Design a protein around this ligand. Structure first.
Ligand SMILES: Nc1nc2c(ncn2[C@@H]2O[C@H](COP(=O)(O)OP(=O)(O)NP(=O)(O)O)[C@@H](O)[C@H]2O)c(=O)[nH]1
Ligand SMILES: [Mg+2]
Length: 165
């Protein structure tokens, strides 16, 4: 068993809790309420010839909670930074989280970007190519996901697993 601390960063409403909830519980609630404080969940996944037990810290995205964020991301093997493909604002917040992360988190932290709500493509505001370049220009992976339709949730975490010895 290889314990991996992962933290979720992103603006409110982007789907951080929905992603974890899909990953861990294989469940989606359209009426999932916001997170107050933080939420911890865990899932063990076989990767190569070793087990990866993800210790997932799903942080509350709301403004009043930013002041509590360094507590969860410090000591993290990886950080999942989530935007909402349907709101471009959520994509600039992603950049502000990346910055804080390169300044206050582990020197060697795995960066993964999730372009959540990809099922709402008919209202897309963030092209995949723009997110792919940004990810490449920061040594991060990018996957467009949908917690709703279970698209690339498992793959998002296979992305983290792949970038570790
Ligand atoms: N269509 C669609 N809706 C989604 C998807 N993921 C999340 N949502 C919806 O988006 C809303 C916010 O989801 P949530 O997971 O709470 O986001 P959050 O970033 O965790 N919220 P908070 O930051 O306040 O804790 C909810 O209504 C949720 O059902 C998705 O892939 N597709
Ligand atoms: Mg939440």
């Amino acid at each position: 068993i290889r314990e991996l601390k992962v933290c979720l960063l992103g603006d409110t409403g982007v789907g951080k809790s929905s992603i974890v909830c899909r990953f861990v519980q294989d469940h989606f609630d359209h009426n999932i309420s916001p997170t107050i404080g933080a939420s911890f969940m865990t899932k063990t996944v076989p990767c190569g010839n070793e087990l990866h037990k993800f210790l997932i810290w799903d942080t509350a995205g709301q403004e009043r909670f930013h002041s509590l964020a360094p507590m969860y991301y410090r000591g993290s093997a990886a950080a999942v930074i989530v935007y909402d493909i349907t709101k471009q604002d959520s994509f600039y917040t992603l950049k502000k989280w990346v910055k804080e992360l390169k300044e206050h988190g582990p020197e060697n932290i795995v960066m993964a970007i999730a372009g959540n709500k990809c099922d709402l493509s008919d209202i897309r505001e963030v092209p995949l190519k723009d997110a792919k370049e940004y990810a490449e220009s920061i040594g991060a992976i990018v996957v467009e996901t949908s917690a709703k339709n279970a698209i690339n949730i498992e793959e998002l975490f296979q992305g983290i697993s792949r970038q570790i010895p």
